[PDB]
Amino acid sequence: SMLKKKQLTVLDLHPGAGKTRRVLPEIVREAIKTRLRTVILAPTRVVAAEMEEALRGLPVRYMTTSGTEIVDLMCHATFTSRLLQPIRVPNYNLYIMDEAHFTDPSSIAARGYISTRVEMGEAAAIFMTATPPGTRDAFPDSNSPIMDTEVEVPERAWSSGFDWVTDHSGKTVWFVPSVRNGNEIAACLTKAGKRVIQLSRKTFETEFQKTKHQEWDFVVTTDISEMGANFKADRVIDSRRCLKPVILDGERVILAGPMPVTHASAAQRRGRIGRNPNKPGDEYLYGGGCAETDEDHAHWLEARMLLDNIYLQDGLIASLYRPEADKVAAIEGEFKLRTEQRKTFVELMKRGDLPVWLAYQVASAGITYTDRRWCFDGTTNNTIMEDSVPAEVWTRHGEKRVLKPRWMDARVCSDHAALKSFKEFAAGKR
């Protein structure tokens, strides 16, 4: 039983090798036999729901939101959200994180907490991913050979050219840098008669169900589909681009304009296809190169904001997982909030659905969750626009006010659904 060894192992078998569907159940059955207190961390509820079916026969308990006889299963974000709530930790001695490449703040924080527990000698851990931090190979092994081709990939709706895009009779997954860009690409495809499904973080649960059927031609998805999303596809079109949230001078979050993805992201996007060992010839068409410039990526600082507010024995604060710990301009403990503000901080993230950085600014200012005056009293440059006109909301006080938050985070108004959500928050609807 290697699982009792207080160590952290990175299971880095190539995409499609069977980490999720074959190795994970083998580990789980060994953990149950050795009577370990085990948690399985899936990146998304969709993937967690899939795991709940595969582990039907085993004593696995899916936690939507007894320790040695039952294995707990939850999302990365659910695990981190629980670490933030007021009681003592659940005290697992084996952590299994699947799709451990996920770079959203809750996943980064979870890896930091877990790796700290291992360094304390209190647990073992397995991080499953073909693309651990520092990977520089965008073209890893696959179950069947992949036809890789560099081509110009449309960044924009097109009315001519790019016949190879629509002169395809199979199923295509197209990775776009943003929801807004995906909306434009999807509309262009639909207009060419294609059946298109769009995926983003906010819509992933409901919309992914559509992809399990025969009747679609394109999936247009942001990077969220890098996290264990399974498609019956024969082609991936990759913009090779993403947006990067960047904190400027500790004062505002901008979404840096579409820039090259990391090698890990490129490998995971390409890794959607070539998964059938008896079906060669899946295509990966990519439009540009990769880059590693995540030193100013807001997610690792946001992860430190989360970890600074997870309370552990004797006032220890967890460090980031070492291979990704050099990427952050933050000192351990500097974002630690006192009890009620930490409560407000969590509320603004969970109930308010605000980005970590924005929730932190509001909470550390001593503002209570229900007090929305900060959404309207910001500096004039923070005015949020909507179809070239200042956005306005009706408040619960019966006032029509211009949306002008005291702190500006571009993620609250980067697409129509985000702006609609933030307007409802500013209006006091949740």
Ligand X SMILES: Nc1ncnc2c1ncn2[C@@H]1O[C@H](COP(=O)(O)OP(=O)(O)O)[C@@H](O)[C@H]1O
**Residue numbers at the binding site for ligand X (CB under 6 A):** 13, 15-22, 143, 230, 275-276
Q: Least Å distance between CB 230 and ligand X?
A: 5
- Nearer to ligand X by Cβ, of 18 and 134: the residue is 18
Q: Least Å distance between CB 130 and ligand X?
A: 7
Q: Least Å distance between CB 396 and Mn ion?
A: 45
- Nearer to ligand X by Cβ, of 16 and 43: the residue is 16
Residue 275 binds what, of ligand X, Mn ion, none (CB under 5 to 8 Å, by partner type)? Answer: ligand X
- Nearer to ligand X by Cβ, of 275 and 342: the residue is 275
Residue 21 binds what, of Mn ion, ligand X, none (CB under 5 to 8 Å, by partner type)? Answer: ligand X
Interacting residues toward Mn ion by CB under 5 A: 19-20, 228
Q: Least Å distance between CB 140 and ligand X?
A: 10
- Nearer to ligand X by Cβ, of 93 and 131: the residue is 131
- Nearer to ligand X by Cβ, of 15 and 245: the residue is 15
- Nearer to ligand X by Cβ, of 15 and 112: the residue is 15
Residue 344 binds what, of ligand X, Mn ion, none (CB under 5 to 8 Å, by partner type)? Answer: none
Q: Least Å distance between CB 144 and ligand X?
A: 9
Residue type, 161: G
Residue 183 binds what, of ligand X, Mn ion, none (CB under 5 to 8 Å, by partner type)? Answer: none
- Nearer to Mn ion by Cβ, of 19 and 244: the residue is 19
Q: Least Å distance between CB 324 and ligand X?
A: 21
Residue 430 binds what, of ligand X, Mn ion, none (CB under 5 to 8 Å, by partner type)? Answer: none
Q: Least Å distance between CB 99 and Mn ion?
A: 6
Residue 230 binds what, of ligand X, Mn ion, none (CB under 5 to 8 Å, by partner type)? Answer: ligand X
- Cα–Cα distances (Å) from 85 to 20, 88, 93, 312, 408, in that order, read 29, 9, 20, 12, 27
Residue 17 binds what, of Mn ion, ligand X, none (CB under 5 to 8 Å, by partner type)? Answer: ligand X
